[PDB]
Amino acid sequence: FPEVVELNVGGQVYFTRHSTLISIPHSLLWKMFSPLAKDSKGRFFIDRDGFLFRYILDYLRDRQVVLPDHFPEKGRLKREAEYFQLPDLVKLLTP
């Protein structure tokens, strides 16, 4: 795996460091990028909502997440956290 990974999430492209992807062991992204579907341009493909991945990705990097005011999609973000298997992130999203 390269040092900076080019991902395609539901058509949303993200560049990120490999260290961020494997930050939480036994998580979905850890299982994927620890020693895969690719698109036409060769980018590794994640079949999930591209917009919500920003905040999933921010948690892996900083182990915390600041949402905007009146964030209309917390329920959706929590669902994504479940898919990527991030128990603590689901916990933070528990009201």
Author numbering: 23 to 57, 65 to 124
Structure paper excerpt:
The human KCTD family contains 25 soluble proteins that share a conserved potassium (K+) Channel Tetramerization Domain (a subtype of ‘BTB domain’) at their N-termini and have variable C-termini. Here, we present novel X-ray crystal structures of the BTB domains of a further five members of the KCTD family and examine the stoichiometry and stability of their multimeric assemblies in solution. Overall, the pyramidal wedge shape of the KCTD family BTB domain creates a versatile scaffold compatible with a range of oligomeric assemblies and geometries that may impact function.
In contrast with the previous work, the expected closed pentameric structure is observed only in KCTD17, whereas the variant C-shaped pentamer, found in one crystal form of KCTD1, is also observed here in KCTD16. The angles between monomers in their assemblies vary from 90° for Kv4.3 to ∼65° for KCTD16, giving rise to observed oligomerization geometries that range from compact to splayed. Evolutionarily distant from these family members are KCTD16 and KCTD1, which belong to closely related clades F and A, respectively. Neither protein binds to Cul3 and both have now been observed to form unusual C-shaped pentamers by X-ray crystallography. We show here that this geometry is also maintained for the KCTD16 BTB in solution. Binding was observed for each of the BTB domains with the exception of KCTD16, which showed no evidence of Cul3 interaction. In contrast, KCTD16 again demonstrated no interaction with Cul3.
